[PDB]
Amino acid sequence: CGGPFELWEPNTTFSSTNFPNSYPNLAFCVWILNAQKGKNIQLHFQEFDLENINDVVEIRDGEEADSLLLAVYTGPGPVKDVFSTTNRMTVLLITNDVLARGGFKANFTTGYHLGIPEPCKADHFQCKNGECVPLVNLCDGHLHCEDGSDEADCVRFFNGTTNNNGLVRFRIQSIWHTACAENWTTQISNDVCQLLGLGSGNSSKPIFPTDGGPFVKLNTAPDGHLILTPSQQCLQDSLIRLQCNHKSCGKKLAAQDITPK
Amino acid sequence: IVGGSNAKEGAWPWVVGLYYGGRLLCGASLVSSDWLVSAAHCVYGRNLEPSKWTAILGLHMKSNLTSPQTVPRLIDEIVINPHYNRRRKDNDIAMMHLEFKVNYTDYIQPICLPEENQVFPPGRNCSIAGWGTVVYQGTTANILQEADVPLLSNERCQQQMPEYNITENMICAGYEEGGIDSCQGDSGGPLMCQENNRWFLAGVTSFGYKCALPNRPGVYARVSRFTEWIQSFLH
Ligand SMILES: *[C@@H]1O[C@H](CO)[C@@H](O)[C@H](O)[C@H]1NC(C)=O
Ligand SMILES: *[C@@H]1O[C@H](CO)[C@@H](O)[C@H](O)[C@H]1NC(C)=O
Ligand SMILES: *[C@@H]1O[C@H](CO)[C@@H](O)[C@H](O)[C@H]1NC(C)=O
Ligand SMILES: *[C@@H]1O[C@H](CO)[C@@H](O)[C@H](O)[C@H]1NC(C)=O
Ligand SMILES: *[C@@H]1O[C@H](CO)[C@@H](O)[C@H](O)[C@H]1NC(C)=O
Ligand SMILES: *[C@@H]1O[C@H](CO)[C@@H](O)[C@H](O)[C@H]1NC(C)=O
Ligand SMILES: *[C@@H]1O[C@H](CO)[C@@H](O)[C@H](O)[C@H]1NC(C)=O
Ligand SMILES: *[C@@H]1O[C@H](CO)[C@@H](O)[C@H](O)[C@H]1NC(C)=O
Ligand SMILES: *[C@@H]1O[C@H](CO)[C@@H](O)[C@H](O)[C@H]1NC(C)=O
């Protein structure tokens, strides 16, 4: 309850309260790991051995009263190193009133952009996991990045009244642009519906050409992959006002009867 | 649920049961083919080993697990909301990932999420579900229980709940005289409200002073605030 408190760079190594033997029960400590402006915290645990779910260590990245949550560690085992995003880290030790374990021991360090790997320059797209894919997985139908960030939103609505309504704004590699409906069919309609997380293709019709950007011509293929070429050669362009209903949401499809009891 | 009756098979094809070590501990709601949405206070301290969480989809009775409608799955990733705070009980919401996809059947369907700028007016009846306890000091329920509770305003809930700090990320529901509300053992239970023949996810069971008590409503995590945070993982 009244253990250590905020530390700085000269003081990195710290026990919990009585790590050499065992920590007492009903303890609530806090180690505010400060740093310099622009330096994050990398908390490496030299040893970690606690009780079950009833005893946890909550690591935060507050920097203010609106603290976030980084990781919750418990139980015996080598825990991963927590990488902060600000110059302040709060470590909370919440313990029960029985079955006291040994404790833990950790020391941190400052730096610049720790944890996040160095983004490769010279036209190298970096997904959230850190893997580099310049143009091989830039919204083309592959899963190079294991976190799924390589298939991020390269298409969204534009000037839409409701949520499931808008334009056909696409993006091939970098620049966002709309598309035309010269050979628009229901196949590509339901395709772009599913790509946006919607249901089956509904009534879609243009109004009038208004955008002069690099419009695209959507084409279909029997293999499944869509072929689109943003060519700036088209008269009387058709801006698709995409109106597609939602997916199969929580509608009770069972054979329930009517009984107002 | 203490003031509800048994539910018909297939009435709630999104309410799933989460077992941790051969015992039902928390509830969740199917939102996608591989993702779930549950309360963060029940998985707080258990997200290190997701393999110990086995999700039971399409569950109707806690004694019939060999039925063909039941499709069991295993958890491989548990994501707790970053803004969660167990002391303040705010942002009590967490998502759980499934190892293998689950085919949508007549008894297994994903729940609907409330869109942006979509507020539910108070005094609106929203149905609840889950295999909670039929009374405060008792045991669980073998059959899937369900009830219906009206929504309350944040101001009235704060006036009726002085022991807690009801923030803007919470939505309350319950009767004035009580008697019909969720209880312990039903954490993560959804607050399902019908809207144009669709059952949205208007709240996840966060906490509560005491169940089956007059003027003591139950607090639910406002899912409409965490809509984008949930949709970020559904991609
Ligand atoms: C490290 O701890 C010592 C012992 O209390 C203290 O004298 C010193 O000022 C600390 N270093 C800081 C705060 O940078
Ligand atoms: C914690 O101490 C270990 C033991 O030397 C060290 O390897 C590790 O880098 C330290 N963590 C820091 C400095 O963040
Ligand atoms: C969308 O609305 C903005 C609002 O002024 C307008 O400038 C723009 O031209 C509109 N785009 C389309 C494609 O309607
Ligand atoms: C559609 O595709 C055909 C394929 O030859 C092409 O000739 C035509 O110009 C395209 N657009 C329209 C509006 O037919
Ligand atoms: C399009 O949406 C309207 C909205 O009510 C619906 O009535 C109609 O059946 C839908 N059409 C298709 C083809 O989904
Ligand atoms: C499971 O359901 C079947 C359906 O007929 C029933 O015969 C059986 O007794 C049930 N088992 C239990 C343990 O309730
Ligand atoms: C689900 O659907 C897929 C696709 O048709 C099928 O291969 C599979 O057998 C179905 N059942 C299960 C349990 O995956
Ligand atoms: C809500 O349900 C209660 C009974 O559970 C009923 O008395 C009340 O009229 C309902 N409210 C609305 C708005 O339907
Ligand atoms: C609830 O918390 C807010 C935010 O700090 C505060 O302004 C308010 O006074 C609190 N209300 C009560 C009753 O504690």
Residue numbers in the entry:
A (entry chain A): 524 to 784
B (entry chain B): 785 to 1019
Which text from the study accompanies this structure?
The functions of these domains and motifs may be involved in protein anchoring, macromolecular substrate recognition and inhibitor specificity. The light chain is homologous to trypsin-like serine proteinases with a typical Asp-His-Ser (D-H-S) catalytic triad responsible for peptidase activity.
Upon cleavage of the hEP into heavy and light chains by trypsin, the enzyme became fully active as shown by the protease activity assay. There was also no evidence of cleavage of the LCM domain as we observed only two bands, corresponding to the intact heavy and light chains, upon activation. Inspection of the cryo-EM structure of this active hEP-core at 3.2 Å resolution revealed an overall shape equivalent to that of the inactive state. Superposition of the hEP-core regions of the active and inactive states revealed additional density near the catalytic site in the active state, corresponding to the surface loops L1, L2 and LD not resolved in the inactive state. The IVGG sequence was observed to be flipped by ~180 degrees, with Ile785 shifted by ~16.6 Å. Upon activation, the conformation of the catalytic triad Asp876-His825-Ser971 appeared to have remained unchanged. Upon activation of the zymogen, the flexible L1, L2 and LD loops form a complete and rigid catalytic pocket ready for performing catalysis.
